[PDB]
Symmetry: D2
Subunit: 355 residues, 4 copies
């Protein structure tokens, strides 16, 4: 038997209509108990099993999977989530870490990439699966993606030792700090543009063990709740004025992700470049990411943004760059130079270095 | 014979190494003249043809294609382009509109989507093709995507009556105000996420005539050079503070595209919503676009951004929303309400209504 | 309320292990009854509803959906199916046509394209949906594609007036005579290479009404059980000998689909071409389809197969060409010439003319 | 300097209109000479270089590339090619192996996959690139894919040590015995359904060295010209009759590829199974391949074709199965059982043994 904790934080998967719009919906365990694919009553009764704990039917091979449902209060639309909410989730996993073999987190899709990236950094030396999932349609609506998404998450966390924060949707498992939301309506809502999926589900389960990170049983779980809140993301657009960038980078901002064009380029008008220098001199750290979905920041043009306090983000997603920026800036007693060196290193599989 | 104007504005296609980096490179016509696929010397000599004008070899069917090369000065990395640069390009097309049957614009890829979207709006009632193109590798490097991209542009503009600003790359023709750059290295650099390509090239040329806009031969070309410069784009990120949004939306800003999550949602914390209202009261117009590559802004959540001065962008790209915002706000003597009505309408094929 | 007939013919969806391999599995209605997503016990009891008939829970909009399960005997692995089996299925639909508003046919995937194509031709002037479906993993196994495939079929047939034989798999609805099986393991097992899906299911249901065929309420259902059995498929391979083709095309064969290379080409060695002429003189009809997944048979080479009794299959799938050949040859009292004209015309949406 | 042999066998790339249809076209070297991208006159003259030999302009990095054009006679539409034509090509490569560092073979697309597969088997212990290429549109037509396809082949063979028979089309390099033609009109005409491309070309060249086979410098090139001619391919279709299968498998046929449904199934009607057994008793060897594009043949159904003289083709393409059948059957002095063991083994990277 393997025991999982299922953390319900909110999002479309549980949602209910109310006033003609979707809002977060309570009473998940009550529903799941009535669904044979989520709960084997026969096995639970013949094991006089705790009434708070559910049991999946047997799968083909492997151990049996049991799980407990922790429903947070209040439940949130993921659009309203912030760094504090993701810290609370990390703390729930810390508190219950020893009692369970894996974790599944039900989450809204709107900011799921940000949440997976954050938790990836907060949960240092993680040894157990933390699988995020969600749905474009609520589980109470008849025709939905939620049933198969939730079941798959539980089976993956239940049956495999993948020690990463991942995202499971639409029969695929992605590295959490590598995903981005690409479609607002289709069930194939997420994409891992610069890395293969960690796993694919069909008849067979195919896992890329060559990519999955190795369990460091030696080192204990450290949960970083000291994340810098004053970080931002700024998308460059053609002709963005120096005066607007000056205003955006004012104190108390400590770090910013600049989303630049193509292979990492921006306008070279000197007054704009001057505001970036000025901000560097005040101590701001800047990471350069590409607005493009696929590919890497690379020098090579007269317009490439490099220099004073500007670290290349290589092929990182913006969601990951931002979370990493928050992590590194929150570490205590480091120099500006040391902080940039950490930003330029692959800390959780979020970044591919060249040769 | 069909005569085309080839406008070389800059970008990687012509570029040259200098100080170990790529910068814009002059002398295009000189090079093209030496390439048989771009210039038929035999036909030019046997027609004693102007020395500034080149001639493509005969294609399978259709008329012969001639073209003149106008090389702008200075040449630009597209990362440095602004609304004024795109206006200059529209003006070149206006000045020479009667003399040519089509236009091809060589452009850097970094801001090509912004440029195609801008020209789409500036060139009202366009009757002739205006085809943008570029390359991830310069034409002077041996292994490149530039040869085939440029030739395809010239043949499309030269042989078909597609009255739109388009982008031709990697054997596909896209509606210009529908594209976005998705790959910084691969030759398949562009994508039209919410609309099919207008055309595909292989053995056959396949054109989606069901999508191509109709020539309005009744109405003359109007070229809008009064585009509002004070428009911006703002990407929401989780926990973005009200104080930072306040600072961003200060005067003199007149319009902004808010890039929101998923189907058009943002944080509902009241102090943030309050700063959007405040800015609406100052007369700011806001368009809501999705950060997602594919799909549409739709109401349906308690977190959906709608209301005071906020127009839904449906499935518009951000590049297109931003250009449309610039166009509509530049029109003289319209009420705020009329401006929002135009923003909610499909003006150049950039937007699908439900 | 809309009432559907669910015809269970066999295939993996229902299957059971036995002797270490998968074989067809009885007792479908018994299982479905126990699944809340397939049967609303509360509504059935509060309507004292027939015990043989199930009821789907309410969907968002639309009418309620009820359905009856007809489990054929014996059940078949689709690899064993033939024209007679598909005729039987058409006859079941004919016998019960008036009593139901739609049909769903559970079928093995191995020959599902052949079956959908056949039924498409057999069911002339169809007014109601006939949706085929199946699964790579049985519905009794916990992790499967069968639950969502079957439910989607029932909801599509139950809620929409799509008067075609279709295939529903993996959240997509395809025109049946346009599909082919491309993957032996993945859940995305099927592809419609030369036509868009008729519909896609996500948050919204998107239907291509521009493609869906029109209901001919005036004309009654005619069910062709006169399908020619003596038709075959022959795949050319490099250096295939004339003597082997002679043997293949001997009487009593009446029609053959030649699967040729690329854009419709074969070897031009004269003894091979001579055997095709000889067979034409005996009255054999030949349809030329491409071995390629995507694209169209087109003349243009010295190696193109055209002439005596050879009709181009354009962009038809082989499964569709073969079924159409069976249909046309089964029609009574037509001249060879008229038969070839029908083969060259789009009769059920299986073929795009240039 | 690296010197290549360019073997022009025929196909659409060189073709000419004549009587309103495309036929093979002579005079390739004459044309290429006039194209600056294929011939640097300045460098050739300043090196007083042989008049039969051309020279590519300099590429970014790497050595300079020179090449000689050998134009076969007669030139062929690939639809008319046979085993004897592919043997002649292997013999050309054998004769000239020591003089050149690589080979490019221009070939019609209609049977290119069969040709690449054949050469793969014929050229044992190959150490140098043999790159096949072709085009959907002739090089003399203005708007074509031929220029870039031919140039890329020459640059790949000229600049990298990939010791395989490959196919280069539309900016991708595929393992030759893994490809199949999937589109009769689009420039993306080929697909490698069960294996990644060996390489991709863009700004950067990306090579999957993890997949490319290793140079066996110890072992010399052996070229097999004893290939069995009496092999065939038979596609099963629903209700195919026993009497027709009997006629197809008559002597002198020695081997056949059965293209079956899905994961490797056919009809189980006993009279059909009886004809397969009869043919096995006459000494016929049978390989089972899937009609599916992205198929592996796997047992698991009552309809799976396995037994007397029937070898599973796993994920092999039919073109590869058919060539392999011709190779193995042509080897001298082997027992029927030994022949089947070779058919079941990955000999040139054409087959993945499963997980
Ligand atoms: N607005 C929802 C979107 C979803 O879950 O699909 C959320 O993020 O909570
Ligand atoms: N940096 C270049 C990119 C390109 O041309 O591909 C530009 O936009 O001008
Ligand atoms: N062998 C099965 C395949 C399936 O159902 O998926 C059949 O064709 O009956
Ligand atoms: N029929 C031609 C097709 C091509 O080359 O594209 C050949 O195979 O020679």
């Amino acid at each position: 038997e393997r025991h999982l904790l299922l953390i319900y934080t909110g999002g479309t998967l549980g949602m209910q209509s109310k006033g003609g719009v979707l809002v977060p919906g309570p009473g998940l365990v009550t529903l799941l108990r009535t669904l044979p694919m989520f709960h084997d009553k026969e096995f639970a009764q013949a094991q006089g099993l705790p009434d708070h704990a559910l049991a999946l039917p047997p799968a083909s091979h492997g151990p049996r999977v049991l799980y407990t449902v922790l429903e947070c209060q209040p439940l949130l639309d993921s659009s309203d989530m912030t760094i504090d909410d993701w810290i609370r989730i990390a703390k729930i996993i810390e508190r219950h870490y020893e009692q369970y073999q894996g974790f599944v987190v039900i989450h809204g899709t709107d900011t799921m990439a940000s949440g997976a990236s954050m938790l990836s950094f907060m949960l240092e030396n993680l040894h157990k699966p933390v699988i995020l999932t969600g749905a474009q349609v609520p589980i109470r609506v008849l025709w939905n993606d939620a049933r198969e998404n939730l079941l798959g998450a539980l089976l993956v966390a239940g049956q495999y030792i993948i020690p990463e924060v991942c995202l499971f949707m639409n029969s695929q498992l992605f590295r959490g700090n590598r995903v981005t939301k690409v479609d607002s309506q289709k069930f194939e809502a997420f994409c891992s543009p610069n890395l293969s999926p960690l796993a694919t589900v069909g008849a067979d389960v195919t896992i890329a063990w060559d990519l999955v990170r190795k369990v460091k049983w030696k080192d204990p779980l450290v949960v970083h709740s000291n994340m810098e809140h004053d970080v931002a993301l700024l998308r460059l657009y053609p002709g963005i004025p120096a005066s607007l960038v000056r205003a955006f980078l004012q104190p108390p901002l400590k770090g910013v992700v600049l989303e630049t064009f193509g292979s990492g380029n921006g306008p070279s008008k000197p007054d704009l470049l001057q505001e970036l220098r000025a901000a560097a001199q005040r101590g701001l750290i800047m990471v350069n990411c590409s607005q493009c979905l696929r590919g890497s920041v690379t020098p090579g043009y007269a317009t490439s943004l490099a220099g004073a306090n500007i670290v290349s983000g290589l092929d990182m997603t913006s969601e990951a760059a931002l979370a990493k920026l928050s992590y590194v800036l929150g570490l205590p007693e480091l120099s500006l130079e040391r902080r940039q060196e950490l930003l330029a290193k692959d800390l959780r599989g979020e970044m591919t270095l060249p040769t």
